[PDB]
Amino acid sequence: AMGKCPTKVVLLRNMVGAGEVDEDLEVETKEECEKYGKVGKCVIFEIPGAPDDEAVRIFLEFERVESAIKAVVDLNGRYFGGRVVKACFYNLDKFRVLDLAEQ
């Protein structure tokens, strides 16, 4: 439900497995996504005890909703490191208070 409401915040799931957050994840994510529009922030958060395909959440805050829509349309179903990425929106206010485990 929240994942279908367009905001400037994009959530990426399934980028890497649980316990597989590496140091280059932020740079690879942000530099590619800069082509949908200006990126303000890139946040990596790992939900403890979550399943392999849900555990690692990568958030991007774009400057504008139009960029975010482009990113969600292009990144959902896209491969990253052999994994099929899931892309959706995230509530801005929840993202900004670090409520990163909703939905």
Binding site: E28, E32, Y79, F80, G81, G82
Partner: peptide, 6 residues
């Protein structure tokens, strides 16, 4: 690797 599309 850039892992995009790989």
């Amino acid at each position: 690797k850039s892992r995009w599309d790989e």
